[PDB]
């Protein structure tokens, strides 16, 4: 994450790391939405252009983590994955439409001061909060700047406002859909920041001014570089795909 800052402790207790087992490698961010259920970007698990095609056994998550350059005994929990579910209309060929996946844990994780699920938005939560100029929060251990294909010690956090659908479309030749939104400061807004490669699957969250709860509105999906004037980060639209998450969840 670019031009962000160190998360305070337990600031994002739903933050999940997704690792390759062997060799042990940090792939992506995720979000905890129940004791059994972790949410991430589909392209963290399946992207044939990078011959990437992970199964349940290939992978492991670490929950309740703050530092990667520490081990956090009796704080961080590690869980294997029982099943991976990719959105059946995930589209990697074109524009990453429905860039969403669910991983179910082998053992349900214990909630602590450091591990706690984020809420998923309802109708009204999407109406009231997902509006242009309104600011959510992005987090992750991803890249610190744009580079070629920046590891930070501490979880990173940046607040970024949502951008009008027409400025998003004008920013890029990439076709965007209703299942996506874009966030970040306009050039000549004066503030900066962005998610980056590595931050994919991490949550874009907003605090409801009604019931004090944190909601996951977005999943870090895509961009062009990181933090360029006149470019914005693109987020999987969590509300528009909620019924799918529900079909998958209501069915163990």
């Amino acid at each position: 994450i670019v031009e962000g800052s160190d998360a305070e402790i337990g600031m994002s207790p739903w933050q999940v790391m997704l690792f390759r087992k062997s060799p042990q490698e940090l792939l992506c961010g995720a979000s905890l939405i129940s004791d059994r259920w972790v949410l991430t970007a589909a392209h963290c698990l399946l992207y044939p252009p990078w011959d990437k095609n992970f199964t349940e056994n290939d992978l492991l998550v670490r929950i309740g983590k703050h530092s990667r350059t520490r081990y956090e005994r009796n704080i961080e929990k590690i869980s294997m994955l029982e099943k991976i579910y990719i959105h059946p209309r995930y589209n990697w060929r074109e524009n990453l439409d429905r860039d969403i996946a669910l991983m179910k844990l082998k053992k349900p994780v214990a909630f602590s001061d450091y591990i706690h699920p984020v809420c998923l938005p309802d109708r009204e939560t999407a109406a009231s909060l997902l509006q242009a100029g309104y600011k959510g929060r992005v987090t992750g251990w991803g890249n610190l700047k744009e580079t070629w294909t920046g590891q930070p010690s501490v979880l990173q956090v940046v607040n970024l406002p949502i951008v009008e659908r027409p400025v998003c479309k004008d920013s890029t030749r990439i076709r965007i859909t209703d299942n996506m939104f874009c966030a970040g400061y306009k050039p000549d807004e004066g503030k900066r920041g962005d998610a980056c490669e590595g931050d994919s699957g991490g949550p874009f969250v907003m605090k409801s001014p009604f019931n004090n709860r944190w909601y996951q509105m977005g999943i870090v999906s895509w961009g062009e570089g990181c933090d360029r004037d006149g470019k914005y980060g693109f987020y999987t639209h969590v509300f528009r795909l909620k019924k799918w998450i529900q079909k998958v969840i209501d069915q163990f």
Binding site: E8, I9, M11, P13, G133, K207
Partner: peptide, 29 residues
């Protein structure tokens, strides 16, 4: 169910360092 409330912040009536910036974003034109 009891989701979205951080043990170390909401549940202790304590606020993080930048959460007011989000609420200010909702009220601003």
């Amino acid at each position: 169910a009891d989701c979205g409330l951080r043990p170390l912040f909401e549940k202790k009536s304590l606020e993080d360092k930048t959460e007011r910036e989000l609420l200010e974003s909702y009220i601003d034109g």
